[PDB]
Structure 1
Amino acid sequence: ATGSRVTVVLGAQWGDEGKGKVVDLLATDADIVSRCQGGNNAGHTVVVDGKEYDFHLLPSGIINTKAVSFIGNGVVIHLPGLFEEAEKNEKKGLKDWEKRLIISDRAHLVFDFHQAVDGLQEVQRQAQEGKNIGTTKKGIGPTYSSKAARTGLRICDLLSDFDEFSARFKNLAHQHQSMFPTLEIDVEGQLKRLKGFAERIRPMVRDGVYFMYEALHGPPKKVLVEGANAALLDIDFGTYPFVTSSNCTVGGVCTGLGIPPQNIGDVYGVVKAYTTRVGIGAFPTEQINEIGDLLQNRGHEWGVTTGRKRRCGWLDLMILRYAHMVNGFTALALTKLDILDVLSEIKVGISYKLNGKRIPYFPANQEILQKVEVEYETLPGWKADTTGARKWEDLPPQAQSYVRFVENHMGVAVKWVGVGKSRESMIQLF
C-alpha cells in the first residue's frame, strides 16, 4: 500500500506529562524509535528495574538494543551535550549505543555560543522588563532563530569541507556577538572540539529522508516517534511567547522526519492527572498553596537537574481539548493517577470565564489567559492506594470515574492509566 505507519507519543499539557514512561513502554519491541523536534532539553525520565534514566537528546528507546535510535532533521543538536549525555548513561550500564544510533545529515547544530546567547537574552529580558521566558538556557531558541535565517549550520556541513565550515562558523559567531558584544567566543577553541566531534559522529550520520522512506515503504516495520516538550509549549500553538521554539505538535513529526501525514498512524496524547508548568507564563489552574505543595511533593515535580520545583495545578480540560484539536489524539495515556490517591476531593477545570462570561475558545493572546476565572468541577476522591492496580477492575470507583471524566470531556479514549513510575506500573484499558 503506502507503507508502514508511525506511532506518535506527544505531550498534551505543558511538559513533564510522563512521556518517557509511555515511549519506553511502547518501544520494548519497536524496530525504530525516533526524535523529531527540539533539542537536548526533553527531560524524559525512564524507570526500568530500579534503574532510572534521564534522556534529553537521545531517544528514550536508546535502551532497547534490538531497536535503532533515530534523530530527525527537525532536531537541533549541541554535540557537547550529546556525548555528555550518552556518557552519563554509559555509566548506568549503557554500552554499544553508538552502534544503534543514526543522525540525520539535515539536522541543525547548537553551538556553544548559541547556549551562551540564550543566557544573555534571558538575563537581558530579565533586568529590563522584569520577566523572561523561563528558558532551559540550552540555546534551542537561538539555534532555531539561526535556522530560520538560514545562517545556522547543519550536520552535513560539519562533515563536508571543514574549511568552508569554519568560515561560516566564524561569521555566525561574529553576528551573534553583534546582538551582545559582551559575548566572547573561543573561536578556534570550539572549532577544535567540533572537528573532533565530526570524526566521532561520521559513522552514525545518514540521509534522513531516504532512511525513513526505506523504513516506511520497505518491508513492514514498527516506528516510534517520541515527541518532546508539549502542546502548550508549541512555537505556533502554545502560550506564545512562553513556549519552546519547535513544533511539539503532530505537524512537527512530518516536518522533522520528512514523512507525509498518511504515514502517521496512532497519535497518543500523554495526559498527567494534574497540571504542571516550569517557566514563566499563564497557568489558569495553578495552585500556589497546600494542594500545589502536595502535588509537587507526591509527584516529584522538580527539575531533574537543577532541583527547581515546577508550578503545580489541577487538571485543566481547556488546554487539553485545545491540544486535541491540533494533534488529533487517537488515544490518551493518563499518568500519575496515584498522585491523587490521598485527596478527598479533586477539582478539574472545565472552562474559562472572562468577566463572568464563558469564553468560547482557548485564547491566542497569553495575556488574556492570565485574567480568566477558572470554572471547576469538584469530583469525589477514591481516598485509596492505586499503586498496585494492574487492570481496570483494581482501580476503585471514583478512580474509574476520574478516568471516564477525562475520556468524556476530551472525547478521546484513554488507552493507558499510569499508576506508578515503573514499566509495570501501567494499566492498558484496551
Structure 2
Amino acid sequence: GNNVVVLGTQWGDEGKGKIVDLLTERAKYVVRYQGGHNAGHTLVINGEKTVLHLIPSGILRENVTSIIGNGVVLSPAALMKEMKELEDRGIPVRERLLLSEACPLILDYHVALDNAREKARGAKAIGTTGRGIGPAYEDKVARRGLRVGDLFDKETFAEKLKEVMEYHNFQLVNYYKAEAVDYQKVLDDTMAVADILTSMVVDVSDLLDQARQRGDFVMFEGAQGTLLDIDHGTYPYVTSSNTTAGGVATGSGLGPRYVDYVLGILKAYSTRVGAGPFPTELFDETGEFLCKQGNEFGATTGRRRRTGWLDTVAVRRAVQLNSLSGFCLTKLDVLDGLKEVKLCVAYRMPDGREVTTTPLAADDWKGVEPIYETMPGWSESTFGVKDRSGLPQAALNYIKRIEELTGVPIDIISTGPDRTETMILRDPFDA
C-alpha cells in the first residue's frame, strides 16, 4: 500500500533502524506518532557516528519531509540540541522538519518528577528515568499540560505554566522532598525558543490527507516494542504510551482506514530489557551465545539484555494488535552455527492446557511452560546473502515455519547491518 507503518513486534531492539533507513529512500514523508526523545537511531553523519532520539533519520534525505505528530511528547531542550548538532553538520533541519501544534511539551519539572520518582519508587540502582516522558503524558490526560500551540499566545502561556508548576512544585517539595523547579527559568528557557518551535508548526492531519490523496509514499515509524504497549503489553512492565499500529491514527491525525501496510520488524530470536515475563528466556550457553553473536548490549550503562528463543505465541499477539501485513525478519545470521534452533509454538499452562494465545485476566505468566519445536540449525553463513538461493535449506525451513505459525509472510529479510545486505520479497509500498 501507500501508507506504511513500521514498528517493533516484540520487546524493543528488533533492529528496525536499518529497515527504516532503507524504506526512507522511497518515502516522501516519515512521521513519528508516539513516544518522545527515546527513538534511539544511530547514524553516520559523514564519518562521525551520531544517535538521534527525537528527529527522524529521514531528515538526512533531501527530498523527504520529517514530521513529528501530536503523539510525540516534545522536550524543546532535546530538539534544539539535535537541531544544532545536525545544522552544525550542514543539514538544513529547519526546512525538512514539521511539528504538530498538539504535541505535549516536556519541561524541567517533568524531568524533575522522574528523577524524584526513581529515587523513591525504584532505588539506588541503574534507575535511568531522566526523561520526563510519562509526566508529560500524565499532564496531557489530566488536561493540565502545555502544548506547542500554547506558545503562539505568550501571555496565556505564562499563566498556564505558572499554575501547572505550583501544582508540581508542591509535590516536588512536600512529597518527594526534592528541590523545587524555578518558574522564571522555565519560562525564560521556553520563550527563548518559542519563535523557533512554532515556526515549524503545520496542520499535520490535513497535510497527510493531501499526501494520501496524491498517492505519496508515507512512512510511519513507531519507536517502542509492541508488547510494551501501555494497554496490551504486560502490565505493569509497559511504557507510558500505546506502541501498537493502532496508535498511528491518534498520534498523527490520519484516519484508521488509511493504514495500507503494517511492517512488523521481527528479530530471529528474542530479548528483553529489565523486569517482565519472558517465557522463552535462556539461562545457559545458548543464551550467552545469542547475546555475544548478537551484541545484545546496552551501548550505554549496558548490563547485557536477556536472551531467549523466538516466541511464536508472543508474536501471534502482535500480529493481532497491529493487523500486521508482513514481517521483516532480522538477525537471522546471529543464529549461524547453532546445531539446532528452537521456536516456541505454544504455551503449556500449569493445568496442562496448551494455548496459542498469551496470558490474560490475571492467572499470570508465572507458570507457563514453553512448548518448543526443535529445528536443525545451519553451518553455512547467512551473513551478506542477498538472494533466497544463498540461504541454506535449514534457514529457509525455519523462516517457512514462522510464516505458518503466524500466518503472516516474511516480506523482507535482513542479513547484515549495511543496507546492501537485504532481501525484499514483496516491498511494503508497491504491494
Task: Using structure 1 for the length normalisation, give the TM-score.
Answer: 0.92
SS in 2 for 1:246: coil
Shift of 1:405: 1.5
Aligned pair partner of 1:153 in 146, 152, 158 = 146
CA distance in 2, matches of 1:179, 1:27: 44
Q: Deviations over 1:236-287 (max 9, x none)?
A: 1111211111121111101111111221111111100111111321111122
Equivalent residues of 2:345, 2:356 under 8 A apart:
no
Mark the CA change 1:107 to 1:369 in structure 2 (over 3 Å): closer, same or farther: same
Mark the CA change 1:395 to 1:42 in structure 2 (over 3 Å): closer, same or farther: same
* Aligned-CA RMSD value: 2.3
SS in 2 for 1:202: helix
Matching residue of 1:20: 17
What amino acid sits opposite 1:374 in the alignment? P
Aligned pair partner of 1:242 in 237, 242, 254 = 237
Mark the CA change 1:46 to 1:8 in structure 2 (over 3 Å): closer, same or farther: farther
CA distance in 2, matches of 1:40, 1:230: 15
Mark the CA change 1:344 to 1:71 in structure 2 (over 3 Å): closer, same or farther: same
Matching residue of 1:56: 53
Mark the CA change 1:146 to 1:6 in structure 2 (over 3 Å): closer, same or farther: same
What amino acid sits opposite 2:208 in the alignment? M
Equivalent residues of 1:231, 1:249 under 8 A apart:
yes
| Aligned positions of 1:132-281 closer than 5 A | 136-158=129-151, 160-181=152-173, 182-183=177-178, 184-217=180-213, 219-281=214-276
Q: How many aligned residue pairs are there?
A: 421
Matching residue of 1:364: 360
CA distance in 2, matches of 1:45, 1:157: 32
Task: Using structure 2 for the length normalisation, give the TM-score.
Answer: 0.91
Matching residue of 1:67: 64
Mark the CA change 1:332 to 1:306 in structure 2 (over 3 Å): closer, same or farther: same
Mark the CA change 1:361 to 1:33 in structure 2 (over 3 Å): closer, same or farther: same
Structure 1 position 108 matched with structure 2 position 104:
yes
Equivalent residues of 1:21, 1:46 under 8 A apart:
no
CA distance in 2, matches of 1:354, 1:47: 47
SS in 2 for 1:189: helix
Shift of 1:144: 0.9
CA distance in 1, matches of 2:415, 2:186: 45
SS in 1 for 2:61: coil
Matching residue of 1:83: 80
CA distance in 1, matches of 2:255, 2:342: 40
Q: Which moved more, 1:13-22 or 1:117-126?
A: 117-126
SS in 2 for 1:170: helix
CA distance in 2, matches of 1:197, 1:366: 47
Gaps in structure 1 of 5+ consecutive residues: none
Shift of 1:67: 0.5
Equivalent residues of 2:37, 2:74 under 8 A apart:
yes
Mark the CA change 1:16 to 1:336 in structure 2 (over 3 Å): closer, same or farther: same
Aligned pair partner of 2:6 in 6, 9, 12 = 9
Equivalent residues of 2:313, 2:356 under 8 A apart:
no
CA distance in 1, matches of 2:46, 2:424: 19
CA distance in 2, matches of 1:195, 1:171: 17
Mark the CA change 1:304 to 1:173 in structure 2 (over 3 Å): closer, same or farther: farther
Equivalent residues of 1:36, 1:226 under 8 A apart:
yes
Equivalent residues of 2:118, 2:129 under 8 A apart:
no
Mark the CA change 1:394 to 1:225 in structure 2 (over 3 Å): closer, same or farther: same
Mark the CA change 1:335 to 1:87 in structure 2 (over 3 Å): closer, same or farther: farther
Equivalent residues of 1:240, 1:366 under 8 A apart:
no
Q: Deviations over 1:120-177 (max 9, x none)?
A: 22332225xx999x7654211111111110111101002x222211222222222223
Equivalent residues of 1:106, 1:207 under 8 A apart:
no
Equivalent residues of 2:261, 2:325 under 8 A apart:
yes
Equivalent residues of 1:283, 1:370 under 8 A apart:
no
| Aligned positions of 1:249-328 closer than 5 A | 249-328=244-323
Mark the CA change 1:348 to 1:119 in structure 2 (over 3 Å): closer, same or farther: farther
Q: Which moved more, 1:58-67 or 1:230-239?
A: 58-67
Identity, in percent, stands at 42
SS in 2 for 1:236: coil
Matching residue of 1:413: 409
Shift of 1:46: 4.8
Q: Deviations over 1:359-394 (max 9, x none)?
A: 452113677123322111121111222112001111
What amino acid sits opposite 2:14 in the alignment? E
What amino acid sits opposite 1:71 in the alignment? I
Shift of 1:119: 2.7
Equivalent residues of 2:67, 2:99 under 8 A apart:
yes
CA distance in 1, matches of 2:46, 2:403: 30
CA distance in 2, matches of 1:196, 1:24: 33
SS in 1 for 2:260: strand
Q: Deviations over 1:64-86 (max 9, x none)?
A: 11110001011111111122234
Equivalent residues of 1:239, 1:366 under 8 A apart:
no
